Design a protein around this nucleic acid. Structure first.
Lengths: 61, 20, 131, 50, 106, 98, 40, 488
RNA sequence: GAAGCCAGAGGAAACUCUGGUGGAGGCUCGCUGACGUGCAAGAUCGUCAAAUCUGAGCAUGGGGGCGAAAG
């Protein structure tokens, strides 16, 4: 009573499938003008600067 | 006491005291 | 059996307060006054009588009509001819005066008559002022 | 009415100024044309129409 | 479910409105003063970094009357700023501070 | 079917062959004679993946027990925790019928 | 008085411990009952 | 049948999204198309399953529009979630507004839509499109027709108001309710007003490496300064939203009073009495003045409205905060005490005294009269500092009241004066003793003021009529009062 | 001298008692004021002040009234 108080290999979704037959068979396998763009870049840094300058308050955050 | 007990709305239905 | 009797009496009394059943309502008062006079029990009719007096028809001016005044001893309803008739509003007018006097004369001797009649007096002066 | 005063206090009218009109003792309220004029001047976009 | 309301929240805006309500400056006077150096400045298609810079450094300097300042404070006052409870604690907090200060004197 | 699975689990060890614990079931799986494997819910994920891998390469059926290792041991009648079980002989139970 | 006061605190402490594990023990005891009963 | 095939797809999608939702962002659209099948059987099943899955997958935060590998897949999954939820709410709205009467094979599709919408309100209020969800509920509450769906929508909003701890969900619903009430010209069922009364806003050695230990130390300091700032911001935002709701709640209350909606004034006055202590001091005196104007207007049905305001006025002052601010804020109830006094004679003649946890909204005018009388004669505060003249004036007038009222009303007043005699005693004893009668004037029944009448110069004579009253309860009630007097 | 643990007796147990082990918070030993509440003619309650020693380095604070705080 006191005691009770990137993914790994898993057989759940492979069971009952032709994939299981393939995997269990076991062959070797390896995995092998108008300034629109300039303006958009400029506004991007302005927002980043404003956000960075406002985020050093810790009450704004 | 008595004033509060008679002040509740479910005192004044209209039930006749012959049909208890 | 006095308590159950006047309970159902006032119940059948206050079913629907309309002019159609004013003669019906008037008779139920007379039954209550007789019971109170023979015994010595108090039955409050002051609200019942004054509710008669404060209805619409005795406020509204009447109409000129001529026919036989109705005898208030054999009617349970009002024929449609009497809706704004001078005769009807007079017919009830004598009645409301009569049962008011009968009710008040019963308790005209007990120690507490002036307080028993005070709210009715104020109401009647008020009604007279508006009329 | 007292109720109207409470409503005005809770939600101030658009032309509310807090002043009292000398001609009629009731509070002085701006009108729509006046409010547009303050809006125009404080931004300066349109000093005069047309 | 089946015009933009102009709501004055600025002290200088309240001041100009007060001058119109009073017989200080008329409608004609306000139009004339609107034709100043700040008039006819483009804003429609200009970037934020350009406009926000001017808004910070190009605010006209105008006097503010105390009556205009008070009205803005009254207009922006919240409905729960001064309840009976909150005012009571402030006075109670006040009496303690003098009471404690009197003790440091003793 | 929590009562049902516990009922057959009690009988299978009371009559048939069974081993308990992670080290014993790996030996059973390596032997190739195992018939059914039970894995507790709180078993570490690496241990779950390891057992499922050996079970596949032996074609030993695997069942994921709903409860924890504690609930598994008591269901088996033992007084100790048990994360993994290997059933070698059903005895007189229908645990391998399905 | 000191005898019951310390006893009363002891009773409250034991009651608190019992209320924490009031049903886990019975559930295990119940689950052990069909364990050694099984199919007979 | 095709329903079995549809059921299989429903089970497939829902379980598949439960286990690993990121891998299959298109199941949300898959739940959509199979819902446009034209059989009502699958449509009912599809709607419920969509409710089930969305409760499972909706996160604990809103997600912004993008506009402008593991990061990209999360973006696609979240965008699919919003698009499906927006489409689901549109389908729920259409079905709810659809015609209810159908074949008596069970509840219609509309009833399930309200069930689904109510569950989402109490489960995921924080998520996006809360207004579209709340608009379904409010649209149902703007019809004045009580049915099962109407109660269900009302119960959902009751739960939301009293479980909202932040305040954003409450504010958006209050704005919707206030706007709908104005748009309907206050023809609502007064259960929607009672929703305002429910607002809660208005009331094992794990080993750690050298670098792992240094990161946690940095994280703890960052969390500490953030927690302090979060505490401060939470107080300001809570107070600000409270002010916004108080603005909408009180504005609706006053606009009902100005238009004088007969079936809502009882509910409004309960709200004013409940929430007056949450607003500014200078507005508290205005509430009393506004009450006086309503009474004066009715002085120009009508008896109940004036009694409703008088009950509210005393209940306003019975609060502890208002009681301690009596002297400071100039809250005098002398107007209401006098007005209640001059109305006692008229109320006797009124025949509709009986035509009927709340403190103000009570259906019986006799009950309202008793609440006012208890406030004047048996206040919660300073019960044994009440002026004796005020006690005597009402005691004499109340025996006169008891003479000419229905049996139960007379019994209620008789019981009330039993408590008054018991609690005060010698202050009213001289009224029943002729030798202790004052001889410094004559009794004035129809006085304009309580003190103007000379009530200690008279004697209670009404016992000689009430001893022969037709109701045994009244006779026993009268005997109860004298028994208390004899024990004084 | 407590929880905890061991043994024995009564009890179905919960527990009760006895004999031990254990040595913890805690307690102990050495050379009074200001306020608040008070719904009465002041009862009962609540807040604060008196707060490990020491060397070498180092930082911040301080008055008044007004105001709900922000100021």
């Amino acid at each position: 009573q006191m005691h009770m108080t990137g993914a790994f290999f898993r057989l759940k979704e492979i069971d009952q499938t032709d994939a299981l037959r393939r995997i269990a068979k076991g062959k070797m396998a390896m995995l092998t003008e108008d300034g629109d763009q300039l303006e958009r870049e400029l506004d991007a840094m302005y927002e980043h600067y404003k956000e960075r300058k406002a985020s050093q308050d810790a009450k704004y955050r | 006491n008595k004033a509060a007990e008679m002040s509740v709305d479910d005192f004044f239905k209209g039930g006749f005291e012959i049909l208890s | 059996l006095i308590y159950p009797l006047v309970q159902v009496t006032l119940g059948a009394m206050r079913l629907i307060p309309t002019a159609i059943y004013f003669p019906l309502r008037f008779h139920l008062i007379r039954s209550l006054l007789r019971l109170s006079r023979a015994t010595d029990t108090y039955i409050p009719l002051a609200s019942a009588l004054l509710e008669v007096l404060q209805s619409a028809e005795m406020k509204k001016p009447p109409k000129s009509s001529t026919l036989k005044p109705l005898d208030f001893a054999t009617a349970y309803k009002t024929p449609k001819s009497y809706l704004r008739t001078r005769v009807y509003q007079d017919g009830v007018g004598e009645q409301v005066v009569e049962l008011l006097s009968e009710f008040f004369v019963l308790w005209s001797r007990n120690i507490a008559f002036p307080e028993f009649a005070l709210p009715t007096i104020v109401a009647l002066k008020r009604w007279m002022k508006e009329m | 009415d007292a109720l109207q005063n409470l409503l005005d206090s809770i939600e101030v009218p658009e032309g509310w100024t807090g002043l009292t009109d000398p001609n009629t003792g009731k509070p002085l309220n701006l009108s729509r044309d006046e409010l547009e004029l303050i809006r125009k001047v404080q931004q300066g976009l349109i000093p005069d129409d047309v | 479910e089946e015009r933009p309301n102009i709501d004055i929240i600025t002290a200088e805006a309240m001041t100009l409105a007060h001058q119109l309500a009073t017989g200080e400056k008329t409608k004609a006077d306000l139009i004339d003063e609107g034709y100043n150096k700040y008039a006819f400045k483009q804003k429609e298609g200009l970037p934020d970094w350009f406009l926000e810079d001017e808004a910070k450094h190009d605010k006209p300097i105008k006097p503010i009357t105390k009556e205009a300042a008070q009205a803005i404070k009254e207009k922006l006052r919240a409905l729960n700023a001064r309840p009976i409870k909150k005012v009571a604690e402030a006075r109670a907090r006040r009496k303690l501070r003098q009471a404690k200060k009197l003790e440091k004197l003793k | 079917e929590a009562q049902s699975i516990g009922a057959k689990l009690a009988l299978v060890i009371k009559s048939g062959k069974v081993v308990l614990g992670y080290r014993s079931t790996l030996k059973a799986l390596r032997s190739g004679k195992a018939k059914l494997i039970l894995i507790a819910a709180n078993t570490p994920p690496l241990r779950k993946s390891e057992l499922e891998y050996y079970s596949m390469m032996s074609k030993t059926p695997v069942h994921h027990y709903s409860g924890t290792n504690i609930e598994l041991g008591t269901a088996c009648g033992k007084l100790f925790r048990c994360s993994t079980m290997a059933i070698l002989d059903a005895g007189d139970s229908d645990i391998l019928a399905d | 008085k000191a005898r019951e006061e310390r006893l009363a605190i002891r009773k409250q402490l034991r009651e608190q411990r019992k209320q924490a594990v009031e049903e886990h023990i019975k559930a295990i005891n119940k689950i052990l009952r069909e364990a050694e009963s099984a199919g007979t | 049948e095709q329903i079995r095939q549809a059921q299989e797809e429903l089970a497939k999608i829902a379980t598949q999204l439960n286990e690993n939702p990121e891998e299959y962002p298109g199941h949300f659209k898959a739940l959509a198309r199979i819902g446009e099948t034209p059989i009502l059987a699958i449509q009912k099943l599809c709607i419920v399953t969509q409710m089930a899955v969305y409760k499972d997958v909706i996160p604990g935060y809103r997600i912004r529009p993008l506009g402008e590998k593991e990061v990209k897949r999360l973006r696609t999954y979240e965008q699919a979630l919003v698009a499906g939820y927006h489409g689901y709410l549109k389908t729920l709205a259409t079905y709810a507004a659809s015609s209810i009467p159908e074949d008596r094979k069970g509840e219609p599709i509309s009833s399930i839509a309200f069930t689904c919408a109510c569950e989402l309100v109490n489960a995921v209020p924080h998520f996006n499109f809360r207004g579209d969800l709340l608009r379904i509920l409010v649209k149902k509450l703007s019809t004045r027709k009580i049915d099962r769906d109407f109660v269900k929508c009302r119960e959902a909003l009751e739960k939301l108001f009293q479980d909202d701890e932040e305040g954003n969900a409450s504010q958006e619903a209050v704005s919707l309710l206030s706007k709908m009430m104005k748009a309907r010209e206050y023809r609502v069922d007064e259960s929607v007003l009672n929703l305002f009364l429910h607002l809660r806003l208005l009331s094992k050695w794990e080993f750690r490496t050298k670098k792992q230990r240094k990161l946690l130390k940095a994280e703890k300091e960052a969390q500490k300064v953030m927690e302090q700032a979060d505490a401060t911001v939470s107080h300001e935002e809570r107070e600000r939203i409270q002010s916004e709701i108080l603005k909408m709640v009180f504005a609706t209350y006053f606009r009902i009073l100005k238009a004088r909606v007969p079936h809502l004034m009882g509910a409004v006055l309960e709200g004013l009495a409940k929430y007056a202590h949450l607003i500014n001091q200078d507005f508290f005196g205005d509430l009393l003045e506004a009450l006086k104007d309503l009474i004066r207007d009715t002085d120009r049905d009508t008896s109940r409205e004036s009694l409703l305001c008088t009950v509210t006025a005393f209940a306003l002052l019975e609060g502890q905060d208002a009681h301690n601010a009596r002297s400071d804020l100039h809250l005098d109830l002398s107007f209401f005490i006098t007005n209640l006094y001059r109305s006692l004679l008229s109320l006797s003649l009124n025949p509709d005294l009986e035509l009927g946890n709340n403190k103000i909204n009570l259906q019986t005018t006799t009950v309202l009269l008793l609440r006012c009388l208890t406030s004047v004669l048996l206040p919660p505060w300073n019960i044994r500092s009440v002026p004796p003249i005020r006690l005597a004036a009402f005691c004499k007038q109340l025996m006169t009241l008891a003479l000419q009222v229905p049996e139960k009303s007379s019994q209620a007043i008789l019981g009330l004066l039993q408590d008054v005699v018991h609690t005060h005693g010698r202050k009213v004893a001289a009224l029943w003793n002729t030798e202790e009668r004052k001889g410094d004037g004559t009794y004035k029944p129809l006085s304009e003021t309580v003190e103007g009448s000379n009530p200690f110069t008279t004697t209670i004579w009404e016992g000689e009529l009430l001893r022969k009253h037709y109701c045994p309860k009244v006779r026993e009630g009268l005997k109860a009062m004298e028994k208390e007097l004899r024990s004084i």
